[PDB]
């Protein structure tokens, strides 16, 4: 079942669409490859693959949203002034987002 | 008696409006009928805007140029 | 007083920016429905035909539209061309200069300036 | 080929040849248009298709007949039918008077199939680049239409282009003698064939004078 | 006048107005007569440009035309 | 006769000596370490950053980072002292006269960039010449690519040796000149 | 009406004829190519000008060329539906 999950198509860009099988003869091929990436309807194989792609891509995007939520939570736990905001929310601006002191970017962080 | 360039021989295109003007391409075949106006068939590595890499040229539009070489059209 | 020129304005401004523009627009839309409307840019107008024929009636501009106009002695040109083609005629070729030129002048483009049929 | 007797669509209400179609606002606009195009065909089974004017339709097992405002809609429906292996469909243009003009399979053979008796209309016997330059045909029959020039005119202007680059060997046209020529048009000597001899001798005199003048400081 | 812009207010720039009339009505009428002449001539010129040259005049118009003696010289002097 | 007022403010050298051809002799400019505007601008920078610093706690990490920023600002002030700045702006200038021996000269960055840019272009051209295929442009031959990238260091000599030996350029009669402009 | 011209470089593809949405083009016998056929445009009065024929033509430069003439438009060349010019 899973023995067909192979990396052999990773190097073969544009495999999913039969209009890209002729090879990258022009730079339009690159843009077409990016344009047809999520167009599961027009890609090669039967309708069952369309359903599999749609559902699994939905799950992957859901994982991406969960990763974004996790990043926000870690920023709030380890890169934030949420403690003093809890103690006095009317005098402290929320801040879970710092900037590194490079190229003077230090000027972006402000007194919260 | 064969007429035109030999098969598989590189020719330089002399058609001014051709996408491959002054380029080079292998001769696929040459039609031997004297009634054919554009008998020479030439294939190219570089496709034109219609994504076509082959075209038929006249007997007076191919000059039997040498092989392209490294980094040369 | 510094005014007293407004007596001219109270007539001219309403006139030239309301009466004249409205009359001009009405006259233009009326002119749009003449058979002569825009006869210099719109194909197939009667006046264009009359002007072209009037030009053709002038003795100087009779053979002006002919792209081959200019040959002072076309018979000499044709004879020289025929002589030059005779020495270069390929083997037992049966094409003469006269019919070759006659068939090279006659093309088949029925849909060229077919708008010269209404006016 | 025999043209059918396609009646005007305003006089053939409720015909058995009409396929069952839903009917939409996309149909031909009556009360403003009188030119209608009609396409007829014979089918084998009541296969559903799509009308060019919105909405679907079901053919009849026998004859079929549809009316459209534009020939393009009829041709689109013809391609759709031909995809379903339905040949023998004919497209007619109906004039306002009711005159029936047989249009699409004009000679009875589809245009993609070679048929004897046809002649290449609007054919040009050279590569597309062989057309004469627009600048050459100014104020001639082809003022802004260099692609309409007959091949003889194209060759003539090509020869003129070849000639008018060897500047030193050209012949400057003599300046006309306005003051002493130009009598009333009734004052002519006729003798047209003698006029070309006069041309020859006058041009010979001009060329001899030019050669003599040039051979003074050259 | 209610001035706008910083410079007019901070420099006191003013726009004087003559208390007299400028031009009397007679002078304006004198200008309007020649303006009407221009107008009539311009309408005629517009008509002539719209209709263009008529080459067929030699069949109907009287006279026999004329080329000025300098125009002939300019013709035969070259181009 | 006071060229400053004659020309509406701008002043002219009025002296023709080779010693004034250097940028350092310009009367528009002045060394930054003795320019009032330079002092005022960097003092204002120090004042603003210090005023921001006092807003935070003494023992916080933000205080230490602001101390580091203050040290960086003072180092910038002392480092640009030899750089030339205008007698009215205080902002140090960049010398683009090919001087080669002044602070802030554009000759050294120009030389460095031209070398590395020629290196990049030469590596790309070498890879394209040695991979005369479209398949090798989408699926890069990484060993050959890095070989060309490393080999590109000798571009200023190899490129010239190809220019003079007829191996860089190609005659116009071998590439598509462009659209036809005539035939008839 | 536009102007659709067929040049000698035609190789009898029939693709231009098939791509035409108003039956302007047709195939005629000829002797200038291995296909013994060239295109023709006997009914350019029905040429809307979509230039699909030019898209379908595979010769190096199109053997069929459509020249747009906007000051020439007829009801057929404009694809008028709501309005009749006859
Ligand atoms: C749940 C949401 C959702 C889903 C599942 C889809 C799914 C799909 N859409 Mg779709 N779409 C959506 C929302 C969605 N869309 C919205 C909200 C719009 C309105 C803008 C569109 C507009 C749209 C069009 C116009 C088209 C599609 C198409 C498609 C299909 C192929 C997409 C593809 O391959 O693109 C591949 C993915 C990309 C090219 C992503 C590139 C990144 C985008 C274009 C730019 C974003 C910039 C970014 C936000 C800012 C950058 C930050 C900056 C600081 C640098 C696929 C079925 C195409 C199709 O053919 O359908 C069959 C098509 O033509 N969609
Ligand atoms: C998906 C949402 C998301 C977004 C937009 C960010 C964005 C950011 N994170 Mg972050 N982070 C996320 C998820 C996210 N993170 C998750 C899920 C975790 C837990 C594993 C972390 C753990 C984390 C730490 C521990 C730190 C950041 C830091 C940063 C900032 C600088 C990143 C950097 O140096 O580039 C790194 C680029 C690469 C590694 C290239 C790949 C940047 C604003 C840094 C920061 O804010 O410094 C003050 C920092 O120290 N993040
Ligand atoms: C040209 C100068 C320059 C340079 C060298 C940088 C460089 C940087 N900036 Mg930055 N910045 C600049 C100009 C510059 N910026 C300007 C002009 C502004 C004003 C708009 C900012 C505003 C700014 C902010 C507000 C932040 C940065 C941050 C960063 C750092 C992390 C980038 C990041 O979050 O990746 C994100 C990378 C990932 C999330 C990895 C994703 C990888 C997968 C594949 C996707 C990076 C060192 C961030 C930082 O320091 O974080 C603590 C940050 O939060 N910059
Ligand atoms: C370039 C020409 C020109 C222009 C743009 C104006 C513009 C103006 N004049 Mg005026 N004027 C002009 C020449 C011109 N004048 C001349 C030569 C005279 C002397 C006869 C006058 C006498 C005059 C009076 C007495 C008054 C104006 C007034 C006005 C104002 C109201 C418009 C109006 O009703 O005018 C009407 C003006 C005329 C009928 C005179 C003829 C107008 C000119 C000569 C025609 C030029 C047309 C030009 C070729 C463009 C043609 C193409 C066009 C369709 C785009 C306006 C600011 C009125 C106002 O309120 O002023 C404060 C007013 O009381 N003008
Ligand atoms: C304000 C006074 C005024 C003006 C401006 C004109 C101007 C014009 N008249 Mg007119 N006319 C006038 C008073 C005036 N007339 C009076 C008092 C009478 C009664 C005796 C007439 C009776 C009259 C007749 C019977 C005719 C004219 C025509 C014309 C046009 C001839 C020029 C041409 O060849 O255009 C050629 C046409 C065009 C370039 C098309 C555009 C012109 C539109 C209609 C007006 C554009 C004005 C613009 C805003 C400036 C010209 C626009 C002739 C004409 O061509 O009618 C249109 C014509 O047959 N006029
Ligand atoms: C067209 C403008 C132009 C050009 C092409 C040059 C070119 C050059 N200048 Mg120059 N210069 C210019 C304007 C220009 N300058 C101006 C406006 C001034 C101010 C008056 C100077 C003042 C100046 C000085 C003071 C020096 C140069 C030097 C140089 C040379 C250094 C480059 C090199 O390879 O060094 C090797 C080079 C030939 C340097 C030099 O002579 O090096 C050879 C040098 O010391 N220039
Ligand atoms: C440090 C910041 C910085 C950045 C980000 C850039 C970025 C850029 N520079 Mg650049 N430049 C900089 C500083 C910088 N420059 C400085 C300080 C100088 C000196 C004044 C230059 C001088 C410079 C020149 C002269 C050129 C660029 C070009 C370019 C662009 C092409 C990148 C490139 O080399 O591709 C990699 C290189 C290639 C793909 C091809 C090789 C081309 C380079 C120039 C090598 C030529 C060497 C040649 C033998 C000598 C040429 C002499 C004469 C023509 C100048 C790119 C946007 C080029 C550009 O914009 O072209 C449109 C260009 O011609 N730069
Ligand atoms: C700010 C932009 C920037 C900068 C500073 C550099 C800097 C550098 N590039 Mg580079 N490069 C850039 C953008 C940039 N690149 C971009 C946008 C491209 C195109 C994707 C490349 C493509 C490129 C190639 C192909 C090569 C370099 C190489 C180099 C190095 C030159 C070799 C050297 O001096 O020895 C250190 C140097 C570290 C060369 C290298 O690393 O040689 C070993 C090399 O061959 N670059
Ligand atoms: C660090 C530094 C340095 C170095 C630098 C460098 C080396 C850089 C490089 C850079 C680079 C290497 C860059 C690149 C860039 C690129 C780009 C930016 C691109 C762009 C593109 C575009 C822009 C596009 C265009 C177009 C086309 C495609 C065609 C058509 C037209 C158009 C225009 C659209 C130095 C030492 C000097 C100094 C200090 C600092
Ligand atoms: C000194 C100076 C200056 C001046 C400058 C100049 C004046 C320059 C010039 C320059 C020039 C006048 C140049 C020219 C050139 C020419 C040519 C002709 C070139 C060519 C090139 C090439 C050919 C390249 C090639 C290559 C390489 C080598 C590498 C990469 C790749 C490639 C292939 C691209 C200024 C004022 C700024 C300032 C001060 C300093
Ligand atoms: S598509 Fe072009 S080459 Fe093919 S038949 Fe039509 S005109 Fe000829
Ligand atoms: S432009 Fe369109 S309608 Fe006209 S001939 Fe070509 S394909 Fe047919």
Automatic annotation (TrEMBL), chain C:
<protein>
    <submittedName>
        <fullName>Uncharacterized protein</fullName>
    </submittedName>
</protein>
TrEMBL record, chain E:
<feature type="transmembrane region" description="Helical">
    <location>
        <begin position="26"/>
        <end position="46"/>
    </location>
</feature>
<keyword id="KW-0812">Transmembrane</keyword>
<keyword id="KW-0732">Signal</keyword>
<keyword id="KW-0472">Membrane</keyword>
<keyword id="KW-1133">Transmembrane helix</keyword>
<protein>
    <submittedName>
        <fullName>Uncharacterized protein</fullName>
    </submittedName>
</protein>
